[PDB]
């Protein structure tokens, strides 16, 4: 992890309050 996972985490930030 650490940089490799950032790819997935990058979505949770968008899957919290996205454009919907």
UniProtKB/Swiss-Prot annotation:
Transmembrane segments: none annotated. It comes from the Eukaryota. Residues 1-20 are annotated as: Critical for cytotoxic activity. This is M-myrmeciitoxin-Mp1a. It comes from Myrmecia pilosula.
């Amino acid at each position: 992890g650490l940089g490799s996972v950032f790819g997935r985490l990058a979505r949770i930030l968008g899957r919290v309050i996205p454009k919907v």
